[PDB]
Design a protein around this ligand. Structure first.
Ligand SMILES: CSC[C@H]1O[C@@H](n2cnc3c(N)ncnc32)[C@H](O)[C@@H]1O
Ligand SMILES: [Zn+2]
Length: 269
């Protein structure tokens, strides 16, 4: 139904779906019914969607969530909503959710596009939220859930898992979109740890400059010698926790040991 309900809004309004802003458009109901479920959206929820499009997942959010803020950037799309859909608890904004200043929200539900997967998720970790269901280009979402020491374990992996609990729920065939995307979708859940692990951002970044470096060397190299001499550092080097491991093998737990180790030696705060 939705399959055919797209096509009567397609050339009803007339956008060429550009992959300049990752315009692929979802058309499977058993994929909206799994996110909305996963999020468990009740009527006390201040939601955040991003890149609503022509809003079928936006739709479901209305008929549950308390307040839905949504952010779209194709000023054409922004309007197509208002005519095609009369919503009583919706709130659309102009801009790229990248930079625009965000409302209040406890949950998030959105298909995040390829170009803004990375900076988005980051901003999103510095926020309160009870919960986050988010759709991703598979390559990225695997990246989120990577285990320590795995092929692709990234700063993002650390940072995400440090805050919360990152489960892939369903992979999603590109057969769900017109246009068909180049790669598959996947669905990530984020439940923030009851007690977070609060890493120094700068440190985390210093280490992950070259993430396949041994901790001793990734520190040697991003020791900005912040007012510190040589015989002390190349001592302090030796005893840094996990001076075996390559940076990309570190668990968040262990980034913290290093953190306080360094802290308790005079080196960042
Ligand atoms: C979910 S289908 C893709 C949708 O995401 C929107 N989109 C792409 N990039 C951004 C962005 N930076 N901010 C907000 N919406 C975006 C596109 O305009 C399209 O409607
Ligand atoms: Zn390197």
């Amino acid at each position: 139904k939705m399959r055919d309900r797209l096509f009567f809004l397609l050339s009803k309004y007339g956008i060429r779906p550009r992959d300049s802003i990752g315009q692929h458009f979802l058309i499977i109901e058993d994929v909206i019914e799994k996110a909305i479920e996963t999020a468990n959206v009740n009527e006390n929820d201040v939601i955040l969607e991003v890149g609503p499009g022509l809003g079928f997942l936006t739709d479901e959010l209305a008929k549950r969530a308390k307040k839905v803020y949504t952010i779209e950037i194709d000023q054409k799309i922004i309007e197509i909503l208002k005519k095609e859909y009369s919503w009583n608890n919706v709130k659309i904004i102009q801009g790229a959710a990248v930079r625009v200043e965000w409302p209040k929200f406890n949950k998030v539900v959105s298909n995040i596009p390829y170009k803004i997967s990375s900076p988005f998720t980051f901003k999103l970790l510095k926020t309160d939220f009870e919960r986050a269901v988010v759709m991703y280009q598979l390559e990225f979402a695997l990246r989120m859930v990577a285990k320590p020491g795995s092929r692709n374990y990234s700063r993002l992996s650390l940072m995400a898992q440090a805050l919360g609990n990152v489960e892939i729920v369903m992979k999603i065939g590109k057969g769900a979109f017109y246009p068909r995307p180049k790669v598959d979708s996947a669905l990530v859940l984020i439940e923030p740890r009851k007690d977070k692990i609060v890493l120094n951002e700068n440190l985390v970044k210093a280490l992950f400059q070259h993430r396949r470096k041994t901790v001793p060397r990734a520190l040697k190299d991003s020791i900005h010698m912040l007012g510190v001499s040589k015989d002390e550092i190349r001592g302090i080097i030796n005893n840094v926790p996990h001076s075996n491991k390559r940076v990309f093998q570190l668990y968040p737990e262990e980034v913290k040991d290093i953190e306080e180790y360094l802290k308790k030696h005079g080196i960042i705060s």
